[model samples]
Target: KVFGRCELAAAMKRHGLDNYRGYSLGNWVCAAKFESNFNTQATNRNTDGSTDYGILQINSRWWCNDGRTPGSRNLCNIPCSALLSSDITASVNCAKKIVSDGNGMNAWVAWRNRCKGTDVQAWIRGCRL
Candidate 1:
């Protein structure tokens, strides 16, 4: 499922991502926008052969078990396929875990390149919080 801006924002907020680890809802929304454009089934394969999965692009190398990436930590203890589901529960949960870890939001390069140190408010500008 492809979610609209406000819809994604509200969903992440409902999942307690707003201000999670000192990052605002807009930051998460902005990161999602860049990572997957709010598409539930988005996937990206890295040059190293690891793959990123779902809306927040949780990686197979450390966060999810895709049964493909060797030496996967599977830190979230979830199958990578779960991240592709439209329900988004697994993806959100894994994202929380990623941020909760030592890396914080820096785990996502897209967030660092695009969302960080930027005014992400426009990502949720018209959303009725």
Candidate 2:
């Protein structure tokens, strides 16, 4: 499933990401836009033989187990396929776990480069949330 900017903002907020780990809804929304264009089925393979999955592009090496990321920690304790589901419940939960573990929003390089420290209010500007 693909989401518009405000759509994603409201969805993330519904899953409790509005200010999780001090990262605002806009922060997550901005990263999702750059990382996956708000597409739930997005996937990117890393040079390290791992992959990123879902809108937020959670990593296979440290977050989800793809059964091919060699020595995956699976800290989220979920199959990587779950992240690609349209529901987005698993994605939001795994993302919360990632940030709460001290990785913070910086876990996604996209967020670091695009949303971090930026005025991201625009990402959620028209959202009713």
Candidate 3:
């Protein structure tokens, strides 16, 4: 289920996902909003036949394993279904790992295209935190 924006923000903050790896909460939240609208169960098939999994739409080609899927680096060393769970702990940690590599948020094209250098503070607007 997709949480409301405020709920999502609170959850993200509780998970310490509001900011990390030289990126701001705005960038993370904006990317999450555009990527999956905070829906953990979200998944999408990409044009290259790879799947994007979970709230961040992590790519199966490099991030997670679906078993039936043919190819993946499995960099996160986790099941794609793990990201599909309601608890976002694994997803947030994996995202941090992705950013910790010095790629920042560049791994997510949606962030680059939509949230990068944009007025992303709007993502956290009205959130008490």
Candidate 4:
């Protein structure tokens, strides 16, 4: 099923974000907007017409791995569903690390290049932390 705007908003709230106007929310929203139009169940087709799944457009093949089995869904099974899925927090934290690491704004700059001046554009301006 597709996650509409309210669903996305609720997801953000469930993730402990009340300030949708701020950088973290704005940045994540923008990334989702660009990545998959905020569609939680969105999937993409590979050249071979194989499927890739979820909001962040995670390649289920790559992300659904468990140690025992190379592609075992149990290995790293981040809930691709659920309104406040742990996957959401993981993705946000990953982005934060990339932005705040020694790269020093490179990730933010790249995001801005794609999403600046949009509704969630404030993230490009800079984060509070």
Would you estimate the TM-scores of all the predictions? 0.97, 0.96, 0.92, 0.47
- lDDT (0 to 1) per candidate: 0.92, 0.91, 0.84, 0.48
TM-score of 4: 0.47
Candidate 1 per-residue lDDT over residues 23-125, each given as its tens digit: 9999999999999999999999999889999999889999999999988789899999999998988998888889998888998999999999998988999
lDDT tens digits by residue: candidate 4, 1-117: 455555565565566554433444565556566666766556565554334445555433334422222333422344323312434665444334344445432343334667655
Q: Tens-digit lDDT track for model 2 on 6-109?
A: 88898999999988888888899999999999999999999999999999999999999999988878989999999999899999999988888776888789
Give the Cα-based TM-score of candidate 2 against the true structure.
Answer: 0.96
Model 2 ranges off by over 4 Å: none
Q: Give me the overall lDDT of model 2.
A: 0.91
Q: Which portions of model 1 show Cα errors greater than 4 Å? A: none
In what order do the candidates fall by lDDT, top score first? 1, 2, 3, 4
Worst 10 residues of 4 by lDDT: 66-75
Runs in model 4 lying further than 4 Å from the true structure: 17-23, 46-51, 65-75, 78-113, 116-129
